[model samples]
Target: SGAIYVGNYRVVNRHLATHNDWANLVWEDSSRDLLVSSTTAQGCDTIARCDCQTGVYYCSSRRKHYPVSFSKPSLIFVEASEYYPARYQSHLMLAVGHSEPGDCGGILRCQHGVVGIVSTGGNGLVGFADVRDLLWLDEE
Candidate 1:
């Protein structure tokens, strides 16, 4: 269910990136977080498998739109590991002074709603945005 595709069924060019990478279903069952290379941090925000691409996360088949927001903050662990976890600051971003390229694109979830993702590192701090001000991609 968590499988990701590359091309689309329309042109039949769609396939999983990791699977097609080596001619094996190596990462066929891998979750989103495990898609990136664990050895080297590219210092980039990588989406191993976008929820919209596969699984039930905002699946266009089940739902006809994007994600939603939460009321109370009692939703998830928010295991933001963009270079591991950091305290959520008051403004918008939480920064880790020094970090590897790992943990980029970690989901900052609010209940079922997605807040933001772990941004790229190696700039100043590992930055992550919040969902308070974002109004474009809320769930139903």
Candidate 2:
């Protein structure tokens, strides 16, 4: 029952049966300006962190987004070994050693910015894409 702010996005979620293990990644279409976490986000004592990390994101001003009630977002270390067929896996999960295994229902934030979304981790850790990868792909 927690929420994290990621740039212009607000991440949030609630466990409801099958949907309980997932979260949403949201952002406002407005405000061309941009900017962007916590110790737990880095500390593996609570959240399982990956050695390789995604690009650091910044937090936007509150004036542009409220967008915790709406946003949600990981587990940790879903390596792209011989298991899957792809380029290579960057950061993927938090692997929180909870009784249920999980991360924040919303965006997981740290001092720099939010790590990513928190999602399904029952049978396995949650899965998330690299935001920094898609952002530029959408334009060019």
Candidate 3:
């Protein structure tokens, strides 16, 4: 279980699946305001601005859009790397999971002074798992 804090849209109590290695990116869409009401793991909460255009939710918190794809599902998960310099350098991954082996999954990488999403076939793992940051969270 963990949380993601992107400026203001905080997703909390996101349990990582044992089989899939993933978490949840939950939010609410009512009154034309797509907001996350959950308490952040960082002991802070803020408002997030969102707009629905072309069936995608554009969140101003991270200045990124969560896209919908018929082929793969979007997921939120933590990515740990033994090669990363320090133990606290693990990254947060926002990815499109469970795609074909060749294509894999799309991914969003976040790290110190870096943030970007994968735009091509999955990096390799059947889920196309990839890398990158953060306020820090306890992934239990």
Candidate 4:
């Protein structure tokens, strides 16, 4: 029988970031054009998309700074909540990585924690990451 076990586990620290914290899961597709933020844009090559998802991007260098490059143009579901300060009440980042470990990237100061709407990574580089979490967290 084609049976498999399903479960949950802690996210690999490598999957987290401080500058632009992407969610643990990311989807990649060649058909869709990857629209990245101005901050993530580079010289003439300002945008990029991938043929696959989840670790499909080839990180050019170590992502240890404000802006990192994709080794081979991969679409990462970045948790870039810092882009919009006005939307703080709508979206919030619980835990994030910084220059050093055990640091807070940003904090949610609203009455209660808000959640994201979608988890799918797209839109040249912007989309609601993980709709499931949005529903899950809202209920909690």
**What's the lDDT for all of these models?**
0.29, 0.29, 0.27, 0.21
Residues 1-140 of candidate 1 have per-residue lDDT tens digits of 12212122000101213444334322211221222111111222212312221111222223222233312212122334423354332213444333334334344443433444443334434333333332222211
RMSD of 4: 18.5
Best by the TM-score measure: 2
Model 2: per-residue lDDT, tens digit, 30-83? 111011111123222122233334322222211121222211222233323332
Worst 10 residues of 3 by lDDT: 125-134
**Candidate 3 residue runs with Cα over 4 Å from true position:** 13-26, 29-35, 38-71, 74-140
Tally clashing residue pairs in candidate 3.
4
Task: Estimate the TM-score for candidate 1.
Answer: 0.26
Candidate 4: tens digits of C-alpha lDDT, residues 18-135:
2342333332212221111112222221111222122211111223322211122223434334332222222211122122222121111112221111122222332222111222
Count backbone overlaps in model 1.
Answer: 6
TM-score per prediction, in order, is 0.26, 0.29, 0.19, 0.17
For model 4, the stretches where C-alpha displacement exceeds 4 angstroms are 1-99, 104-107, 112-133
Name the TM-score of candidate 3: 0.19
Q: Give candidate 1 regions above 4 Å deviation.
A: 1-92, 95-99, 121-125
Q: How do the candidates rank by lDDT, highest first?
A: 2, 1, 3, 4
Candidate 2: residue 10 lDDT (0-100): 29
Backbone clashes in model 2: 25
- Cα misplacement distance, residue 76 of candidate 3 (Å): 15
